[PDB]
Protein backbone atom coordinates (compact mmCIF):
# COMPACT_ATOMS: atom_id res chain seq x y z
CA UNK A 1 0.00 0.00 0.00
CA UNK A 2 1.22 3.52 -0.80
CA UNK A 3 -0.13 5.83 1.90
CA UNK A 4 -0.92 9.45 1.49
CA UNK A 5 0.83 11.83 3.85
CA UNK A 6 -2.16 12.66 6.09
CA UNK A 7 -3.49 9.11 5.79
CA UNK A 8 -0.23 7.79 7.24
CA UNK A 9 -0.13 10.43 9.97
CA UNK A 10 -3.59 9.33 11.02
CA UNK A 11 -2.69 5.63 10.99
CA UNK A 12 0.44 6.35 13.05
CA UNK A 13 -1.63 8.31 15.55
CA UNK A 14 -4.21 5.51 15.69
CA UNK A 15 -1.41 3.14 16.69
CA UNK A 16 0.01 5.46 19.37
CA UNK A 17 3.16 6.68 17.60
CA UNK A 18 2.44 10.39 17.98
CA UNK A 19 4.82 11.82 20.59
CA UNK A 20 6.08 8.31 21.33
CA UNK A 21 9.46 8.65 23.07
CA UNK A 22 8.92 12.39 22.61
CA UNK A 23 8.90 12.26 18.80
CA UNK A 24 6.07 14.21 17.23
CA UNK A 25 3.97 12.80 14.42
CA UNK A 26 5.78 14.91 11.82
CA UNK A 27 9.06 13.21 12.71
CA UNK A 28 7.53 9.79 12.07
CA UNK A 29 5.88 10.84 8.80
CA UNK A 30 9.14 12.45 7.65
CA UNK A 31 11.05 9.26 8.47
CA UNK A 32 8.54 7.16 6.52
CA UNK A 33 8.69 9.56 3.56
CA UNK A 34 12.43 9.21 3.17
CA UNK A 35 12.72 5.56 4.20
CA UNK A 36 9.96 4.16 1.96
CA UNK A 37 8.17 7.01 0.14
CA UNK A 38 5.12 5.83 2.14
CA UNK A 39 5.15 2.37 0.44
CA UNK A 40 4.46 -0.48 2.85
CA UNK A 41 6.05 -2.96 0.43
CA UNK A 42 9.45 -1.24 0.20
CA UNK A 43 12.50 -3.48 0.65
CA UNK A 44 16.18 -2.70 0.33
CA UNK A 45 19.15 -5.05 0.60
CA UNK A 46 22.17 -3.83 2.53
CA UNK A 47 25.79 -4.52 1.59
CA UNK A 48 26.17 -6.81 4.63
CA UNK A 49 23.33 -9.07 3.49
CA UNK A 50 20.62 -7.81 5.85
CA UNK A 51 17.44 -6.28 4.40
CA UNK A 52 15.28 -3.31 5.40
CA UNK A 53 11.52 -3.85 5.32
CA UNK A 54 8.43 -1.73 5.06
CA UNK A 55 7.22 1.78 5.68
CA UNK A 56 10.03 2.46 8.19
CA UNK A 57 12.69 0.22 6.60
CA UNK A 58 13.22 -1.93 9.67
CA UNK A 59 16.39 -3.98 9.42
CA UNK A 60 16.68 -7.79 9.71
CA UNK A 61 20.08 -7.59 11.48
CA UNK A 62 18.35 -6.95 14.82
CA UNK A 63 14.60 -6.57 14.55
CA UNK A 64 12.87 -9.21 12.42
CA UNK A 65 13.48 -12.69 11.05
CA UNK A 66 13.93 -13.24 7.31
CA UNK A 67 15.93 -16.47 7.50
CA UNK A 68 18.75 -15.06 5.39
CA UNK A 69 20.70 -12.71 7.72
CA UNK A 70 23.30 -14.95 9.38
CA UNK A 71 23.94 -14.13 13.02
CA UNK A 72 21.07 -11.70 13.21
CA UNK A 73 18.47 -11.34 15.92
CA UNK A 74 14.68 -10.95 15.80
CA UNK A 75 13.98 -8.55 18.69
CA UNK A 76 10.51 -7.60 17.46
CA UNK A 77 9.60 -11.33 17.36
CA UNK A 78 8.07 -11.12 13.88
CA UNK A 79 8.80 -12.34 10.37
CA UNK A 80 10.15 -9.47 8.31
CA UNK A 81 7.29 -10.05 5.86
CA UNK A 82 4.87 -8.83 8.57
CA UNK A 83 6.51 -5.42 8.12
CA UNK A 84 5.21 -5.22 4.52
CA UNK A 85 1.48 -5.42 5.34
CA UNK A 86 -1.05 -2.78 4.37
CA UNK A 87 -1.88 -2.56 8.10
CA UNK A 88 1.00 -0.77 9.84
CA UNK A 89 0.47 -2.33 13.32
CA UNK A 90 3.55 -4.59 13.15
CA UNK A 91 5.80 -1.83 11.82
CA UNK A 92 4.58 0.57 14.53
CA UNK A 93 5.02 -1.93 17.35
CA UNK A 94 8.54 -2.72 16.17
CA UNK A 95 9.42 0.95 15.64
CA UNK A 96 8.45 1.61 19.25
CA UNK A 97 11.07 -0.94 20.33
CA UNK A 98 13.69 0.52 17.98
CA UNK A 99 13.20 4.12 19.09
CA UNK A 100 13.45 2.98 22.73
CA UNK A 101 16.80 1.21 22.23
CA UNK A 102 18.99 4.16 23.25
CA UNK A 103 19.59 6.44 20.26
CA UNK A 104 16.06 7.61 19.63
CA UNK A 105 15.21 8.16 15.99
CA UNK A 106 18.89 8.27 15.02
CA UNK A 107 18.42 4.53 14.42
CA UNK A 108 16.85 5.68 11.13
CA UNK A 109 19.81 7.11 9.23
CA UNK A 110 17.49 8.85 6.76
CA UNK A 111 15.69 10.53 9.67
CA UNK A 112 19.01 11.80 11.01
CA UNK A 113 20.16 13.00 7.60
CA UNK A 114 16.89 14.39 6.19
CA UNK A 115 14.42 15.06 9.03
CA UNK A 116 16.32 15.82 12.24
CA UNK A 117 16.29 19.54 12.98
CA UNK A 118 14.02 20.41 10.05
CA UNK A 119 10.46 21.77 10.06
CA UNK A 120 8.94 18.32 10.51
CA UNK A 121 5.52 19.82 11.33
CA UNK A 122 5.21 20.52 7.59
CA UNK A 123 4.66 16.77 7.15
CA UNK A 124 1.35 16.90 9.04
CA UNK A 125 0.34 20.41 7.98
CA UNK A 126 -3.30 20.57 6.95
CA UNK A 127 -4.08 17.04 8.20
CA UNK A 128 -7.32 16.42 10.11
CA UNK A 129 -5.77 14.52 12.98
CA UNK B 130 -15.23 -5.76 8.30
CA UNK B 131 -16.34 -5.48 11.93
CA UNK B 132 -14.83 -2.29 13.34
CA UNK B 133 -13.92 -1.68 16.90
CA UNK B 134 -15.52 1.32 18.55
CA UNK B 135 -12.45 3.59 18.63
CA UNK B 136 -11.25 2.25 15.28
CA UNK B 137 -14.52 3.38 13.69
CA UNK B 138 -14.45 6.75 15.45
CA UNK B 139 -11.00 7.32 14.00
CA UNK B 140 -12.04 6.28 10.48
CA UNK B 141 -15.08 8.57 10.66
CA UNK B 142 -12.88 11.44 11.77
CA UNK B 143 -10.40 10.68 8.99
CA UNK B 144 -13.26 11.07 6.50
CA UNK B 145 -14.52 14.35 8.01
CA UNK B 146 -17.67 13.12 9.76
CA UNK B 147 -16.80 14.51 13.18
CA UNK B 148 -19.06 17.51 13.87
CA UNK B 149 -20.43 17.26 10.33
CA UNK B 150 -23.74 19.15 10.26
CA UNK B 151 -23.08 19.75 13.96
CA UNK B 152 -23.17 16.06 14.92
CA UNK B 153 -20.31 15.01 17.16
CA UNK B 154 -18.34 11.84 16.56
CA UNK B 155 -20.14 10.01 19.36
CA UNK B 156 -23.45 10.50 17.57
CA UNK B 157 -22.07 8.86 14.43
CA UNK B 158 -20.48 5.97 16.33
CA UNK B 159 -23.70 5.44 18.29
CA UNK B 160 -25.70 5.39 15.05
CA UNK B 161 -23.33 2.84 13.52
CA UNK B 162 -23.47 0.69 16.67
CA UNK B 163 -27.22 0.35 16.55
CA UNK B 164 -27.62 0.30 12.76
CA UNK B 165 -24.97 -2.34 11.99
CA UNK B 166 -23.13 -3.34 15.19
CA UNK B 167 -20.07 -1.86 13.40
CA UNK B 168 -20.28 -4.48 10.58
CA UNK B 169 -19.63 -3.00 7.14
CA UNK B 170 -21.37 -5.96 5.50
CA UNK B 171 -24.71 -5.58 7.31
CA UNK B 172 -27.82 -5.67 5.11
CA UNK B 173 -31.48 -5.62 6.06
CA UNK B 174 -34.52 -5.92 3.80
CA UNK B 175 -37.45 -3.62 4.50
CA UNK B 176 -41.11 -4.58 4.21
CA UNK B 177 -41.49 -2.30 1.16
CA UNK B 178 -38.77 -4.14 -0.76
CA UNK B 179 -35.95 -1.63 -0.30
CA UNK B 180 -32.76 -2.70 1.49
CA UNK B 181 -30.47 -0.97 4.00
CA UNK B 182 -26.73 -1.34 3.40
CA UNK B 183 -23.57 -1.09 5.42
CA UNK B 184 -22.22 0.45 8.58
CA UNK B 185 -24.93 3.15 8.59
CA UNK B 186 -27.72 1.08 6.96
CA UNK B 187 -28.24 3.44 4.05
CA UNK B 188 -31.49 2.73 2.24
CA UNK B 189 -31.91 1.93 -1.48
CA UNK B 190 -35.25 3.81 -1.71
CA UNK B 191 -33.41 7.13 -2.09
CA UNK B 192 -29.66 6.85 -1.75
CA UNK B 193 -28.08 3.99 -3.72
CA UNK B 194 -28.86 1.71 -6.65
CA UNK B 195 -29.43 -2.01 -6.10
CA UNK B 196 -31.53 -2.68 -9.19
CA UNK B 197 -34.36 -4.20 -7.16
CA UNK B 198 -36.15 -1.23 -5.52
CA UNK B 199 -38.79 -0.17 -8.07
CA UNK B 200 -39.31 3.57 -8.31
CA UNK B 201 -36.35 4.33 -6.11
CA UNK B 202 -33.66 6.94 -6.61
CA UNK B 203 -29.86 6.80 -6.31
CA UNK B 204 -29.00 10.22 -4.85
CA UNK B 205 -25.53 9.19 -3.68
CA UNK B 206 -24.76 8.00 -7.25
CA UNK B 207 -23.32 4.67 -6.10
CA UNK B 208 -24.19 0.99 -6.25
CA UNK B 209 -25.49 -0.12 -2.87
CA UNK B 210 -22.72 -2.74 -2.81
CA UNK B 211 -20.18 0.12 -2.47
CA UNK B 212 -21.71 0.71 0.96
CA UNK B 213 -20.50 -2.72 2.15
CA UNK B 214 -16.76 -2.13 1.62
CA UNK B 215 -14.16 -2.40 4.35
CA UNK B 216 -13.23 1.20 3.49
CA UNK B 217 -15.98 3.48 4.77
CA UNK B 218 -15.42 6.36 2.28
CA UNK B 219 -18.59 5.67 0.24
CA UNK B 220 -20.77 5.25 3.33
CA UNK B 221 -19.39 8.49 4.83
CA UNK B 222 -19.85 10.50 1.63
CA UNK B 223 -23.42 9.27 1.30
CA UNK B 224 -24.18 9.83 5.00
CA UNK B 225 -23.09 13.45 4.57
CA UNK B 226 -25.77 13.86 1.90
CA UNK B 227 -28.40 12.12 4.04
CA UNK B 228 -27.75 14.18 7.15
CA UNK B 229 -27.94 17.35 5.03
CA UNK B 230 -31.37 16.49 3.57
CA UNK B 231 -33.42 18.39 6.16
CA UNK B 232 -34.02 16.20 9.21
CA UNK B 233 -30.46 15.79 10.42
CA UNK B 234 -29.69 12.43 11.96
CA UNK B 235 -33.40 11.67 12.44
CA UNK B 236 -33.07 10.02 9.02
CA UNK B 237 -31.56 7.13 11.02
CA UNK B 238 -34.51 5.82 13.01
CA UNK B 239 -32.20 3.87 15.32
CA UNK B 240 -30.25 7.07 16.04
CA UNK B 241 -33.49 8.83 16.97
CA UNK B 242 -34.69 5.95 19.13
CA UNK B 243 -31.42 4.88 20.77
CA UNK B 244 -28.84 7.70 20.54
CA UNK B 245 -30.63 11.06 20.40
CA UNK B 246 -30.44 12.82 23.75
CA UNK B 247 -28.22 10.18 25.36
CA UNK B 248 -24.62 10.44 26.57
CA UNK B 249 -23.21 9.84 23.09
CA UNK B 250 -19.72 10.93 24.20
CA UNK B 251 -19.48 7.53 25.93
CA UNK B 252 -19.08 6.02 22.45
CA UNK B 253 -15.72 7.76 21.95
CA UNK B 254 -14.61 7.70 25.59
CA UNK B 255 -11.00 6.63 25.93
CA UNK B 256 -10.31 6.79 22.18
CA UNK B 257 -7.05 8.32 20.94
CA UNK B 258 -8.59 10.59 18.35
Ligand SMILES: Cn1c(=O)c2c(ncn2C)n(C)c1=O
Nearest residue numbers: 061062063073075098101107
Ligand atom coordinates in the same frame (compact mmCIF):
# COMPACT_ATOMS: atom_id res chain seq x y z
C1 LIG C 1 25.57 -4.94 20.00
N1 LIG C 1 24.12 -4.88 19.94
C2 LIG C 1 23.52 -3.98 19.17
O1 LIG C 1 24.17 -3.23 18.52
C3 LIG C 1 22.15 -3.93 19.11
C4 LIG C 1 21.42 -4.78 19.84
N2 LIG C 1 20.12 -4.51 19.60
C5 LIG C 1 20.06 -3.50 18.72
N3 LIG C 1 21.31 -3.14 18.42
C6 LIG C 1 21.30 -2.04 17.47
N4 LIG C 1 22.03 -5.69 20.62
C7 LIG C 1 21.25 -6.62 21.42
C8 LIG C 1 23.38 -5.74 20.68
O2 LIG C 1 23.92 -6.54 21.37
Ligand SMILES: Cn1c(=O)c2c(ncn2C)n(C)c1=O
Nearest residue numbers: 190191192202204227230236
Ligand atom coordinates in the same frame (compact mmCIF):
# COMPACT_ATOMS: atom_id res chain seq x y z
C1 LIG D 1 -40.41 12.93 -1.46
N1 LIG D 1 -38.96 12.83 -1.42
C2 LIG D 1 -38.35 12.32 -0.35
O1 LIG D 1 -38.99 11.94 0.57
C3 LIG D 1 -36.98 12.24 -0.32
C4 LIG D 1 -36.26 12.67 -1.36
N2 LIG D 1 -34.97 12.47 -1.07
C5 LIG D 1 -34.88 11.91 0.14
N3 LIG D 1 -36.13 11.77 0.61
C6 LIG D 1 -36.11 11.18 1.93
N4 LIG D 1 -36.88 13.18 -2.44
C7 LIG D 1 -36.11 13.65 -3.58
C8 LIG D 1 -38.23 13.27 -2.47
O2 LIG D 1 -38.78 13.72 -3.42
Ligand code: NA
Nearest residue numbers: 006007143144
Ligand atom coordinates in the same frame (compact mmCIF):
# COMPACT_ATOMS: atom_id res chain seq x y z
NA1 NA E 1 -7.53 8.68 4.36
Ligand code: NA
Nearest residue numbers: 020096097100
Ligand atom coordinates in the same frame (compact mmCIF):
# COMPACT_ATOMS: atom_id res chain seq x y z
NA1 NA F 1 5.62 1.04 24.68
Ligand code: NA
Nearest residue numbers: 059062098107
Ligand atom coordinates in the same frame (compact mmCIF):
# COMPACT_ATOMS: atom_id res chain seq x y z
NA1 NA G 1 18.98 -0.76 14.27
Ligand code: NA
Nearest residue numbers: 014015135136
Ligand atom coordinates in the same frame (compact mmCIF):
# COMPACT_ATOMS: atom_id res chain seq x y z
NA1 NA H 1 -7.27 0.62 15.17
Ligand code: NA
Nearest residue numbers: 149225226229
Ligand atom coordinates in the same frame (compact mmCIF):
# COMPACT_ATOMS: atom_id res chain seq x y z
NA1 NA I 1 -20.13 18.38 2.41
Ligand code: NA
Nearest residue numbers: 188191227236
Ligand atom coordinates in the same frame (compact mmCIF):
# COMPACT_ATOMS: atom_id res chain seq x y z
NA1 NA J 1 -33.83 8.38 4.01
